[PDB]
Design a protein around this nucleic acid. Structure first.
Ligand SMILES: Nc1nc2c(ncn2[C@@H]2O[C@H](COP(=O)(O)OP(=O)(O)OP(=O)(O)O)[C@@H](O)[C@H]2O)c(=O)[nH]1
Ligand SMILES: Nc1nc2c(ncn2[C@@H]2O[C@H](COP(=O)(O)OP(=O)(O)OP(=O)(O)O)[C@@H](O)[C@H]2O)c(=O)[nH]1
Ligand SMILES: [Mg+2]
Ligand SMILES: [Mg+2]
Lengths: 225, 386, 424, 50, 260, 134, 243
RNA sequence: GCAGUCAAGCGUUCAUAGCGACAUUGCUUUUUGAUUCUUCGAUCGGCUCUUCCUAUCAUACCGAAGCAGAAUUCGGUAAGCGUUGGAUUGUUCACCCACUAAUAGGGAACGUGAGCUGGUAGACCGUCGUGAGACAGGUUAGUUUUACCCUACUGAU
RNA sequence: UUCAUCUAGACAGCCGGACGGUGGCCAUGGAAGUCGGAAUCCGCUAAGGAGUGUGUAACAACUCACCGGCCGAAUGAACUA
């Protein structure tokens, strides 16, 4: 202890008698043992071994490439229909959206429908009484913010959702606020500092969701400029 | 599913099938390996179990916490009168196993072994070995030819001996017969030893001595048809369960289509043949010399046999072997003492046991006196005396 | 405090990821089927997410609790570890790990989402999503863990110093002799080659003086350095001299040796004398008039004491050591047994009873050929500790020696011999 | 722990056997043969009482 | 299970009443739920109701109401089907909120607070009959229930909640009606807290003893008085302490905290 | 560890959930709680031990400063029928309890009543604090 | 002085009793504790293994001076015979019938005085007052009534445990007629009698006792040439900064 | 996951279309380990007893680690042997403190439904209904009962 | 299958050379080809990098990249199936 004591020890006495020969022989046998591990290591270990070996091959290829290589529009027009980026999305059945819920001791009444997918309810939601509610939009499947990307600027932002204007499946779903793929939403954009001609600040814009958030907790979307 | 709580098995699957043994006399299934360098020696002996008793010993065991301290211990007593030799068997090697190719018997034999060969002795004419004794005529051509056969072939030699049940208090009149292996060298010398030893006895001092670790092979005390709880050691169901509580309730949730060999059912408990090894001899006592139960520390003349004799057994008027602890079998049985099959690397088989005292009190109750003289002296003179 | 060595290993990000995910794939079950109940499928993937979260937070907690709080320890250790490890980087890395311990949020959110999974594919994708976000968080921890493993190895090898104990610093210029002073005075593995910064760290040694543990500290070096620029090796020396409650021995080496001139030596002394205001200083010369004026230079400081001596002789070393210890203990007791007596109660005489045998006796030299056998060795001869049977007899004192191996009878017919056994 | 059939423990036992234990095991054989021969000679002496 | 019911009740409610014990409102406050309601749900109203105002003097109630009206309306109340206080004021406030929420077609009012504060009893007081089960033991309401008045106001009963603020203590949690004292092991160690909180004059007027020292001696005096002793002569300190701790919370022993 | 000697076997009398006596004047009267050190692990079986065995315990009756506080210490009397390897079966009037730290050192300084021979031989500081052995 | 350890314990009462004319030890696995005494003593005096009622705790089971040796009721006839045979006729050995069987805890003694537990009298204890040796005193060491454990003694000086007061020390040194001091053993132990055995010429304790404690022991018992108990005059502030 | 960058290759008989492995950027909230830790709508758990899998918790043998020693971390062969006692039903799709060498995961049922044990008829409160009654609820009380047959299994002729 | 080297001697082995301005410039307690940042030039050459790695506190020493001697005829790389 107290400092680099083994470095001192190696300076004073020195490593072993049988250290350099054995290291040379390990480096020599590694060529055999690499192939031995390839023809062996059944399963996940062999898969990972192959992945590592492929990545190592690519690294050395790029290194040698770097070695051997190290040995009309203007600037402003470079870098440059009204169709949304997702028309014709997969169609959702009413069965795949609504789950049946049964009420009573002997459960015999169903009349209740739970929406299985992620939802946007609003700002003043305030659940209905149980005897009067039929549509159930559970609290975990309730989104307030989305992950909206501007195609330009290569930038994304975690913006608060303002509304749902168009879910392409059965405009009932728009009023329920179902955020399925291809759904069009109004999001706030005051964080970006956008302003129209006249000096009026823009604080709302349309965006289209690109993912199926029933499979991912994320609601990812693309701005419609 | 995965049982939620691991626990060990109930019972040992090696001591199966738990059936009645096919003979009252357990069969020795292995004798020690022969070294042909060493003298001729018996590998085993026969005896009759006679109760148990208690001793005190002075323990010179270094490392222990009774080092140089006294220790009370139980011991078993086997009545071991001398054993009589009556025959020889030679066991040749084959690529199927070991085969006997000849057996040779002695000239004269006792009514005991004849009774062993017979099953209704009081009616028979007792014609057992007449023609063999006749075959023991002038030169014994047949006897010598079969002995020479054993010398030539046969590989290993065992000796047929019997007991002297006549000497014990047991009411049987019929001797046991057993093959006991000879473990010295020179098959010729083995055969010569046996030839010279026909019609002659071998005492237990000539097969064992103190501080020796021996194995007891016997049969264990049948109790009869017994249930799961006492035959394997299972838990009991709480109370007033359906179809009873002294059993296994079930196998669980999962569904087989058969009952396995592993699920602890009812049946016979006892009369199984057992081989219990490494019991240390504490005394090789002799009937010729009284004061067997006495000791260097005691100097109180008395034999080991307690007051009123042993229970369900008589007196020890014969040579006996004392071993420590608990052997298989109950009193009045036939046990075989074998010697250890292997050199034992424990200091337990080196320590020279020394006794201080032996308990010769009555086992027919709570015994307080070692001798009737002590009882007389303590109680004092009674009404009947004078 | 004092040897923060018990810190578990800090693996890099990829290895930590492989560990925590393979543990999940191994311990938790791997098989479910579509025909099974949706509750079974949900419980499966929930168990996976929860176990994966628990692994990461266990690992991170082992880092956070095992590592010391660089504030909240002692100012000396704080400043030392700051000049070594850059306190800002240290705290920033540990805060990164704390905020990553996020994983809990992901696990809770995705489990609560998994409660509503209506299909094996949905549940599988949610599980994959949780583990992937965990992996992203850990991938963003590549550099701090590399920093922290190195700091772990270093801080484990640091020495255990108590700042409050009786201490003495050994200071001077590079290449003086102050380190093989430590070598000679005390057990210590230190290098003494002839060049400036042979040692780059503090080295500690212990000794016992007057039935008290002292600790001597060799410090690598100080240069004259106008002090708004200096390196982390000299700032160790400065912080050690400033913090600790020691005596301090400045070695001058009055000689052409050292590769350093006496003017520069006294210059450094006058530079660092503000640290000496409360530190019990001594100067030692390790063998013209201006060079002597430069010595009364330093004598004119109020609290100081000069000594001349050598590494050539080994008694002046112990001399000056004891001087330094005595200088310290005095104002230690300043900054801070009763035996009773009879009072003459009687005339009855009392005196030590000792036989002539012990006074005629010879001590036990363990390294003499001709000596006493001492039953240890009789054991070694016969057989080891657990085999040798000692005879409790062979020591006993009797009228006749031929009866050594006798036994006394204990019991006769009913009676016991010890009860009837009188001489008369 | 180290099992019964552990190679190292069995090698240690193998080294112990050839020494202090086999001597004690071999002495008993000579003793018991010396007793076995006398139990024959006494029977012969009793046979020669007739 | 309980906090699921809490959040369900809140999400179903348009108004949230927060029931406090006038003995220890700041103890019974639950600030984390108010912070959640601030950040998550500003469209809810979150008012206070001091209850058990009949156990403390009028000036303590006025002081607490003054201290809390600075931030939240804070009515005072006493719950009883026969002899009540604050019923009309609370009715007026609820119909005010109803008049504000004229479009919803109904307005739901949740009852939040610690256990044993009087939520069920307040609802039973508004309806003026036994609608909800009531008991002096804490956990009688185990699951929510809707109750109706005006065809326009829906009361919701909630179970009791305590947040896991670990600055709290088992003693502080005991001296708020939370636990059933039958299940605690050594009830004797808490009687010093009872002496600390309560006044000796009320405490001797209640049990009619006198002049004790040493709460360990207090218990044995009370046990010798009540004949509450074991087979032999050991007085049962455990059960007597359990009874004292039940009395303290149930209000057989008068006690109260002063405000600033 | 802390004890001097081997794990020797004497019969078990004191399962979990057993209130036994303390007679020293450290302040305690009683000892209850769970644990026994050097206990096996078998389904459905109680941890119960003696042989000067160390056990976890609380003061059910005593001073509040040490009530509510788990502590280790050692059995000195049992009242079950124990066997001495030198002859006879032994048993005491009662169970007895008393208090210590994990190294075998006592919080109290003297013991009342007899203490077991094997318990004192196994624990030194018990033998120093005990005036009465057997 | 001397430090050593058997099996691994710093408490010497587990193994031994020691006076000017004999040394009792316990029988153990190894003859290393016996050899530790044989080294400093040689064959000059009796060094004797054996147990007391099959127990090793013999300094705490026994007590005696150069004139004799008291052993308890639980002692067997054989161990008693063994002690008689192994010791000369100069030391009278006696088996005592008493309720308090730990004589080395109940008694602290030297060749000229003895302290005892304040509990029961006896015929031959009131007779031992002047028969066997000399003065007995029923006293108590700062409330600790286990005098042979909480106080070590010899003819030249005495040690007590550190919670003893100056007043009680002066009161007890008057009875013993020799100087006392309060100290600790084996890294902070109040129990001195078990942790240490001492006499007019030699001291044996554990490996863990510190150098200041050894220096006090050496001082108060007059071991090194010369240490007449006010060498504490020299080592004043060592003990100050130690404690 | 979404949207991107790059480029090893593929490349309508395209050089300047498209596809694209390995790497890599942004979004997830923060930079100084203060995070008071703070739960948000799921249509089972517990006894006896047996075996099996390895994706090994411990024990056995090895490798690499700034691995001084001591302890520990990562990993290779390995399923031979073990993998507990309890508290908690205002509930437990669980957690708590202890003992321990260790307190590893699962299957053979739950790929409709199958040992033994907890979790329709009467009555009350709540919501709704004109009502009969129903339920968003909640509480309470509340009778399946083999084997003597074949096979298997265990013992016995 | 394609591309390359080869009796003006290929591949593999041993041996030797592997220089000079120059310890190139910043930096530092020290860093001389080899902790780092940025230049990365010329000279003499058969060839010899302001240097491929081991190493030193720094130098040193060894090494490869490159050249030559001995050896005496085939060899290497990338791809496809
Ligand atoms: N004349 C003399 N020279 C000494 C003596 N001791 C050391 N030296 C010299 O000191 C030189 C080495 O310096 P160090 O002992 O390492 O002192 P230092 O360099 O200041 O120690 P550090 O700064 O901690 O590394 C040696 O070359 C010795 O010649 C001594 O006793 N007498
Ligand atoms: N003196 C007094 N006692 C009250 C008052 N309100 C309630 N109580 C008593 O407090 C006891 C317990 O309070 P609860 O009415 O159950 O209040 P709660 O715990 O929120 O009710 P649950 O929701 O059913 O748990 C009741 O048994 C009442 O006797 C009050 O205003 N004054
Ligand atoms: Mg140097
Ligand atoms: Mg309540």
């Amino acid at each position: 202890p107290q400092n680099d004591y083994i470095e001192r020890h190696i300076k004073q006495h020195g490593k072993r008698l049988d250290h350099e020969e054995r290291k040379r022989k390990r480096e020599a046998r590694e060529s055999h043992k690499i192939s031995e591990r390839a023809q062996k290591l059944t399963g996940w270990k062999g898969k990972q071994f192959a992945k590592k070996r492929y990545a190592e091959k690519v690294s050395m290829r790029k290194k040698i490439k770097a070695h051997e290589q190290s040995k009309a529009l203007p600037t402003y027009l470079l870098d440059r229909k009204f169709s949304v980026p997702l028309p014709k999305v997969r169609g959702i059945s009413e069965e795949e959206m609504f789950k049946v819920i049964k009420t009573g001791k002997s459960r015999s009444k169903s009349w209740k429908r739970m929406i299985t997918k992620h939802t946007f309810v609003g700002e003043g939601f305030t659940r209905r009484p149980v005897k009067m509610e039929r549509i159930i939009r559970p609290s975990a499947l309730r989104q307030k913010k989305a992950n909206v990307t501007h195609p330009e600027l290569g930038v994304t932002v975690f913006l608060p959702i303002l509304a749902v204007k168009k879910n392409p499946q059965s405009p009932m779903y728009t009023q329920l606020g179902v955020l399925t793929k291809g759904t069009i939403i109004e999001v706030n954009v005051s964080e970006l500092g956008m302003v129209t001609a006249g000096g009026k600040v823009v604080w709302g814009k349309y965006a289209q969701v690109t993912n199926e958030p029933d499979r991912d907790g994320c609601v990812n979307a693309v701005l419609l400029v | 599913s995965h049982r939620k709580y691991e626990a060990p098995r109930h019972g040992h699957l090696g001591f199966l099938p738990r059936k009645r043994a096919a003979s009252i006399r357990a069969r020795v299934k292995a004798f020690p390996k022969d070294d042909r360098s060493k003298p001729v020696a018996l590998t085993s002996f026969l005896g009759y179990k006679a109760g148990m008793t208690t001793i005190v010993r002075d323990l010179d065991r270094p490392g222990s916490k009774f080092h140089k301290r006294e220790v009370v211990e139980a011991v078993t007593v086997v009545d071991t009168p001398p054993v009589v030799v009556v025959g020889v068997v030679g066991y040749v090697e084959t690529p199927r196993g070991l085969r006997s190719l000849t057996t040779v018997w002695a000239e004269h034999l006792s009514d005991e072994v004849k009774r062993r060969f017979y099953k209704n002795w009081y009616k028979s004419k007792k014609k057992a070995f007449t023609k063999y004794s006749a075959k023991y005529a002038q030169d014994g051509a047949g006897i010598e030819r079969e002995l020479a056969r054993i010398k030539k072939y046969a590989s290993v030699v065992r000796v047929l001996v019997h007991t002297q049940i006549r000497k014990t208090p047991l009411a049987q009149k019929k001797a046991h017969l057993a093959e006991i292996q000879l473990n010295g060298g020179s098959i010729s010398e083995k055969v010569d030893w046996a030839r010279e030893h026909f019609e002659k006895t071998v005492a237990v001092d000539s097969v064992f001595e103190q501080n020796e670790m021996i194995d007891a092979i016997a049969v264990t005390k049948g109790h009869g048809f017994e249930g799961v709880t006492h035959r394997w050691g299972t838990k009991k169901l709480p109370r007033k369960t359906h179809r009873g509580l002294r059993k296994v309730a079930c196998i669980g949730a999962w569904h087989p289509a058969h009952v396995m060999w592993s699920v602890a059912r009812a049946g016979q408990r006892g009369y199984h043949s057992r081989t219990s090894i490494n019991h240390k001899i504490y005394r090789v006592g002799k009937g010729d010399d009284e004061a067997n139960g006495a000791t260097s520390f005691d100097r109180t003349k008395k034999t080991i046999t307690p007051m009123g004799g042993f229970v369900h057994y008589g007196e020890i008027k014969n040579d006996f072997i004392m071993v420590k602890g608990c052997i298989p079998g109950n009193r009045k049985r036939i046990v075989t003492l074998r010697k250890s099959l292997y050199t034992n690397t424990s200091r337990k088989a080196l320590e020279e046991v020394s006794l201080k005292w032996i308990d010769t009190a009555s086992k027919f109750g709570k015994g307080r006196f070692q001798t009737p003289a002590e009882k007389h002296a303590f109680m004092g003179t009674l009404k009947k005396d004078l | 405090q004092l040897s923060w060595k018990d810190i578990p290993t800090v693996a890099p990000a990829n290895d930590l990821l492989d560990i925590v995910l393979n543990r999940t794939q191994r311990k938790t079950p791997t098989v479910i089927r579509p025909g099974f109940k949706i509750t079974r499928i949900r419980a499966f993937y929930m168990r996976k997410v929860k176990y994966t979260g628990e692994g990461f937070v266990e690992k991170f907690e082992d880092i956070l609790k095992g590592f010391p709080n660089i504030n909240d320890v002692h100012p000396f250790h704080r400043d030392l570890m700051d000049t070594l490890y850059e306190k800002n980087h240290y705290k920033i890395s540990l805060a990164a790990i704390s905020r990553a311990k996020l994983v809990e949020q992901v696990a809770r959110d995705y489990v609560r989402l998994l409660k509503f999974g209506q299909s094996l594919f949905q549940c599988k994708q949610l599980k994959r999503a949780a583990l992937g976000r965990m992996a992203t968080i850990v991938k963003k921890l590549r550099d701090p863990l590399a920093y922290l493993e190195q700091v772990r190895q270093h801080i484990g090898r640091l020495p255990s110093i108590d700042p409050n104990t009786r201490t003495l610093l050994i200071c001077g210029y590079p290449n003086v002799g102050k380190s093989s002073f430590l070598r000679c005075i005390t057990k210590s593995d230190v290098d003494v080659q002839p060049y400036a910064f042979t040692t780059k760290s503090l080295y500690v040694g212990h000794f016992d003086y007057k039935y008290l543990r002292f600790q001597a500290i060799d410090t690598p070096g100080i240069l004259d350095r106008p002090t708004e620029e200096m390196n982390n090796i000299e700032m160790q020396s400065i912080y050690a001299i400033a913090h600790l409650r020691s005596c301090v021995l400045y070695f001058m080496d009055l000689s052409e040796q050292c590769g350093f001139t006496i003017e520069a030596q006294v210059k450094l002394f006058h530079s660092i004398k503000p640290l000496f205001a409360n530190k019990s200083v001594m100067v030692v010369i390790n063998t013209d008039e201006e060079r002597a004026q430069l010595l009364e230079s330093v004598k004119e400081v109020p609290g100081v004491e000069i000594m001349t001596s050598s590494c050539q002789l080994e008694e002046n070393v112990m001399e000056v050591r004891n001087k330094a210890c005595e200088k310290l203990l005095a104002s230690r007791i300043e900054n801070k047994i009763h035996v009773a007596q009879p009072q003459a109660r009687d005339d009855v005489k009392r005196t030590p009873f000792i036989p002539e045998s012990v006074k005629n006796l010879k001590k036990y030299d363990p390294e003499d050929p001709n000596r006493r056998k001492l039953a240890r060795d009789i054991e070694a001869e016969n057989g080891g500790a657990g085999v040798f049977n000692v005879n409790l007899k062979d020591k006993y004192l009797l009228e006749d020696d031929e009866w050594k191996n006798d036994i006394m009878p204990e019991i006769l017919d009913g009676k016991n011999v010890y009860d009837f056994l009188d001489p008369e | 722990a180290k099992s019964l059939r552990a190679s190292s423990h069995l090698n240690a036992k193998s080294v112990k056997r050839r020494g202090v234990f086999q001597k004690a095991v071999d002495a008993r054989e000579q003793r018991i043969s010396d007793k076995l021969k006398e139990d024959l000679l006494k029977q012969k002496l009793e046979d020669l009482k007739k | 299970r309980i906090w699921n019911e809490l959040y369900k009740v809140i999400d179903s409610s348009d108004v949230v009443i927060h029931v406090l014990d006038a003995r220890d409102p700041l103890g019974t406050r639950c600030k984390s739920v108010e912070e959640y309601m601030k950040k998550e749900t500003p469209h809810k109203h979150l008012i206070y109701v001091l209850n058990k105002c009949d156990l403390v003097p009028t000036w303590v109630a006025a002081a607490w109401v003054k201290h809390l009206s600075k931030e939240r309306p804070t009515l005072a109340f006493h719950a009883s089907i026969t002899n009540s206080f604050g019923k009309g004021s609370l009715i007026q406030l609820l119909r005010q909120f109803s008049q504000l929420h004229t479009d919803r077609k109904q307005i739901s009012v949740g009852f939040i607070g610690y256990p044993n504060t009087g939520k069920s009893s307040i609802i039973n007081t508004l309806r003026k009959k036994k609608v909800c089960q009531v008991a002096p033991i804490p956990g009688e309401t185990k699951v929510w229930q809707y109750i109706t008045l005006m065809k326009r106001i829906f009361l919701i009963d909630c179970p009791g909640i305590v947040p896991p603020s670990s600055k709290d203590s088992e003693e502080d949690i005991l001296f708020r009606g939370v636990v059933r004292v039958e299940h605690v092991t050594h009830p004797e160690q808490y009687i010093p807290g009872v002496l600390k909180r309560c006044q000796v004059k009320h405490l001797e007027r209640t049990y009619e003893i006198s002049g004790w020292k040493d709460a360990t001696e207090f218990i044995e005096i009370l046990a010798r008085k009540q004949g509450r002793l074991l087979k032999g002569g050991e007085p049962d300190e455990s059960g007597v302490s359990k009874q004292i701790l039940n009395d303290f919370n149930r209000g057989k022993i008068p006690w109260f905290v002063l405000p600033p | 560890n802390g004890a001097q000697g081997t794990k020797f076997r004497i019969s078990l009398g004191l399962p979990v959930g057993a209130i036994m006596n303390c007679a020293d004047n450290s302040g305690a009267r009683n000892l209850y709680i769970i644990a026994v050190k050097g206990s096996g692990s078998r389904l459905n079986r109680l941890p119960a031990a003696s042989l000067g065995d160390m056990v976890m315990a609380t003061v059910k009756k005593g001073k509040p400063e040490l009530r509510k506080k788990v502590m280790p210490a050692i059995v000195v009397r049992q009242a079950k029928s124990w066997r001495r390897r030198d002859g006879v079966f032994l048993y005491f009037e009662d169970n007895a309890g008393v208090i210590a730290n994990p190294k075998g050192e006592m919080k109290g300084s003297a013991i009342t009543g007899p203490v077991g021979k094997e318990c004192a031989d196994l624990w030194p500081r018990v033998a120093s604090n005990s005036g009465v052995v057997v | 002085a001397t430090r050593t350890q058997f099996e691994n314990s710093n408490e010497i009462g587990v193994f031994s009793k020691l006076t000017n004319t004999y040394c009792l030890v316990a029988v153990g696995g190894s003859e290393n504790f016996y050899s530790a005494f044989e080294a400093e003593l040689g064959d000059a005096i009796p060094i004797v293994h054996t147990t007391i009622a099959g127990t090793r705790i013999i300094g705490r089971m026994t007590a005696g001076n150069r004139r004799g040796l008291l052993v308890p009721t639980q002692t067997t006839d054989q161990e008693l015979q063994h002690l008689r045979n192994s010791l000369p006729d100069s030391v009278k050995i006696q088996r005592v019938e008493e309720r308090l069987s730990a004589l080395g805890n109940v008694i602290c003694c030297n060749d000229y005085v003895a302290l005892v537990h304040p509990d029961i009298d006896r015929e031959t204890e009131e007779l031992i007052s002047d028969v066997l040796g000399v003065e007995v005193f029923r006293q108590t060491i700062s409330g600790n009534i286990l005098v042979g454990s909480y106080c070590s003694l010899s003819n030249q000086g005495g040690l007590v445990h550190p919670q003893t007061s100056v007043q009680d020390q002066e009161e007890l040194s008057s009875l013993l007629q020799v100087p006392l001091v309060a100290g600790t053993v084996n890294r902070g132990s109040s129990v001195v009698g078990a942790g240490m055995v001492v006499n007019d010429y030699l001291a044996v304790t554990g490996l863990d006792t510190t150098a200041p404690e050894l220096s006090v022991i050496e001082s108060i018992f007059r071991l090194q040439d010369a240490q007449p108990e006010s060498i504490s005059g020299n080592l004043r502030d060592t003990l100050i900064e130690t404690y």
